[PDB]
Amino acid sequence: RILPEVKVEGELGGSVTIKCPLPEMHVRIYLCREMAGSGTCGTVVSTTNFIKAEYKGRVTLKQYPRKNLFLVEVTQLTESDSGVYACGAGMNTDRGKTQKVTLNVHS
Amino acid sequence: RIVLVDNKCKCARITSRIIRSSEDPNEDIVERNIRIIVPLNNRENISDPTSPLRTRFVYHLSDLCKETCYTYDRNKCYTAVVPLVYGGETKMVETALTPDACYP
Amino acid sequence: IRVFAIPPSFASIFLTKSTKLTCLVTDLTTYDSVTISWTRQNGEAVKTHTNISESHPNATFSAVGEASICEDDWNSGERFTCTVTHTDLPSPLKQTISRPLHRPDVYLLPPAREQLNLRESATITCLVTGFSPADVFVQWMQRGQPLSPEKYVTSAPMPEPQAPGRYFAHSILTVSEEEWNTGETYTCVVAHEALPNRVTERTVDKSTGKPTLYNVSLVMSDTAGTC
Amino acid sequence: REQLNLRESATITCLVTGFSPADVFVQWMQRGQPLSPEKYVTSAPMPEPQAPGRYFAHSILTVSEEEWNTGETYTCVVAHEALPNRVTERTVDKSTGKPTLYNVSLVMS
Numbered sequence: 001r002i003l004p005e006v007k008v009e010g011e012l013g014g015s016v017t018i019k020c021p022l023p024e025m026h027v028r029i030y031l032c033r034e035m036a037g038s039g040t041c042g043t044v045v046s047t048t049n050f051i052k053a054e055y056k057g058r059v060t061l062k063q064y065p066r067k068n069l070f071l072v073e074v075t076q077l078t079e080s081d082s083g084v085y086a087c088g089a090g091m092n093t094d095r096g097k098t099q100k101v102t103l104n105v106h107s
Numbered sequence: 108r109i110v111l112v113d114n115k116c117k118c119a120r121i122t123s124r125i126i127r128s129s130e131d132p133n134e135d136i137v138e139r140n141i142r143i144i145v146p147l148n149n150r151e152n153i154s155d156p157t158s159p160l161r162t163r164f165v166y167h168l169s170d171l172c173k174e175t176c177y178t179y180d181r182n183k184c185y186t187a188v189v190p191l192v193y194g195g196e197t198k199m200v201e202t203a204l205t206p207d208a209c210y211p
Numbered sequence: 212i213r214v215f216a217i218p219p220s221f222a223s224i225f226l227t228k229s230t231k232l233t234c235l236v237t238d239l240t241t242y243d244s245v246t247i248s249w250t251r252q253n254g255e256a257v258k259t260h261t262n263i264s265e266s267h268p269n270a271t272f273s274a275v276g277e278a279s280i281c282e283d284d285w286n287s288g289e290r291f292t293c294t295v296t297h298t299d300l301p302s303p304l305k306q307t308i309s310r311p312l313h314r315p316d317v318y319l320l321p322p323a324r325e326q327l328n329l330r331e332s333a334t335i336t337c338l339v340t341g342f343s344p345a346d347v348f349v350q351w352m353q354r355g356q357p358l359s360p361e362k363y364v365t366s367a368p369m370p371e372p373q374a375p376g377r378y379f380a381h382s383i384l385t386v387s388e389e390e391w392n393t394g395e396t397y398t399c400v401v402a403h404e405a406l407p408n409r410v411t412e413r414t415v416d417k418s419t420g421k422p423t424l425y426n427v428s429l430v431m432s433d434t435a436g437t438c
Numbered sequence: 439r440e441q442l443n444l445r446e447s448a449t450i451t452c453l454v455t456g457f458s459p460a461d462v463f464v465q466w467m468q469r470g471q472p473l474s475p476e477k478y479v480t481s482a483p484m485p486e487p488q489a490p491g492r493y494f495a496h497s498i499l500t501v502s503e504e505e506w507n508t509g510e511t512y513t514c515v516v517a518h519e520a521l522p523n524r525v526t527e528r529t530v531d532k533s534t535g536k537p538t539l540y541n542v543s544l545v546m547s
């Protein structure tokens with residue numbers, strides 16, 4: 001139920017980094033975009049190699065055991081209605097989401 | 108608010124509140140806000156799946172204000188042991204029903 | 212010629228931890244006792260007696276004798292004798308007092324709705340039942356600070372009509388209706404010898420009581436196997 | 439509620455407040471004829487902690503738990519001089535505590 005709201009801004013040339021708590025458990029760490037139309041959550045990147053088809057090659061992830069932190073970095077942002085992204089751990093996405101954020105690509 | 112029965116085994120959470128109502132006299136309201144989260148598809152014996160499907164769901168507001176229960180906690184773990192042939196010798200091996208909750 | 216000996220009370224060993232045998236002698240013409248003494252079956256002496264009272268308005272003198280004893284000097288099953296002397300009887304008068312159980316139950320009862328409709332003062336009550344022996348102390352605490360005894364009263368314990376071994380009593384506190392509208396801690400603290408910690412508080416507020424409007428919001432899904 | 443869960447015998451409390459003269463009388467009427475004096479116990483009148491010259495009292499009736507679900511009255515009658523008719527009485531039953539409307543929601547998706 002935590003709300004670590006962050007208001008990073010990013011254009012097409014702008015790159016946006018999202019900070020997530022890393023429990024170091026290493027079973028699964030992921031970011032999940034909540035789907036406004038369906039009313040549920042939709043994974044974008046995880047510990048697994050899968051990635052969104054529209055987002056292929058544009059988003060990467062960094063693990064920091066030294067600081068126990070997880071980085072989701074997006075190099076290019078194509079005016080997405082950047083909804084709410086939830087960091088989470090574990091296979092079950094809805095039950096494993098820890099923190100949620102939302103920002104704005106425009107300004 | 109007043110609901111110190113957040114026991115996540117039977118899911119209950121029946122809190123109490125007082126409608127700071129429209130500013131008339133103490134014509135107030137007392138509530139009991141239940142939210143039971145039925146697993147419904149879980150198994151009878153919570154630590155052993157060989158038990159049949161748990162159909163009945165009993166809910167007494169006495170024992171849930173603290174036992175067999177229905178769901179899994181993130182802070183606790185439930186495990187199991189399994190055999191295998193691999194030919195002749197059968198060796199017990201330990202598995203965990205709750206991954207990302209008690210993974211070694 | 213009035214001579215009496217009174218034992219200590221639980222309301223003093225919990226409030227101040229000051230168990231002490233008292234010996235009150237009054238109505239004697241010249242002097243109640245020129246020398247107070249307290250003796251025991253094993254022949255153990257006692258401490259000093261002081262705080263002597265002035266003569267009564269009815270042409271007689273009052274005297275008191277103190278036997279400051281240990282806490283276990285009354286729960287070990289032994290007797291106490293108050294040696295008192297006068298001037299007309301050549302024999303030193305003697306008097307003896309000694310000591311002879313079930314756990315109580317405490318119940319909070321909410322003020323009746325009718326007096327809440329009148330808006331002067333609701334009376335909260337805590338009933339203590341089934342205690343043996345009749346050795347219960349009751350006090351009222353608000354927000355962790357006790358209230359003055361002038362605000363609440365406690366009933367002298369009476370024997371149960373059906374269970375003579377058991378005893379029952381109660382205490383009541385009057386509070387302004389508006390205060391109970393806003394609400395307070397309202398703790399009835401109870402102290403009986405048949406209690407683990409000597410302690411069994413129960414409390415009440417506007418939040419608790421008879422619920423007049425529920426609303427259950429139980430949910431169903433099909434994967435919350437992990438509440 | 440907690441007394442009713444012991445499933446043994448319940449206690450009715452009858453409280454009288456604010457009367458100036460002492461020596462009030464309390465009797466327990468059971469929908470018709472009275473009851474034996476040993477089925478109820480009344481206390482003495484003590485002064486009011488709040489009021490200067492007013493008193494109060496309290497009486498207890500002990501009944502079996504099962505008698506409530508039967509649905510009997512067990513009314514309390516009191517007599518005192520200051521009453522307009524020198525006598526009054528009240529009553530209470532399990533049907534007095536139940537009045538409450540519920541409220542239920544039940545989603546399943």
Ligand SMILES: *[C@@H]1O[C@H](CO)[C@@H](O)[C@H](O)[C@H]1NC(C)=O
Nearest residue numbers: 126138140425426427428543
């Ligand atoms: C329960 O009642 C309160 C106030 O009456 C209301 O705010 C709340 O939404 C209700 N809950 C449900 C599940 O209807």
